[PDB]
Amino acid sequence: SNKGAIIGLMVGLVVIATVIVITLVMLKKK
């Protein structure tokens, strides 16, 4: 449970990951 206090930082980072995964959906057509 050493990453329990990190959850507050990962929760805000994941939201940023959802933006990168979609960016690939567009360039995929190029």
Side-chain angles (χ1 to χ4, degrees), residues 12-28:
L13 175 60
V14 60
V15 184
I16 306 298
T18 307
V19 185
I20 306 299
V21 294
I22 301 173
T23 305
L24 300 171
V25 184
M26 181 60 212
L27 51 83
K28 182 181 294 182

Side-chain angles (χ1 to χ4, degrees), residues 2-15:
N2 297 30
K3 59 169 65 182
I6 317 301
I7 305 174
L9 307 158
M10 293 184 177
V11 62
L13 175 60
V14 60
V15 184

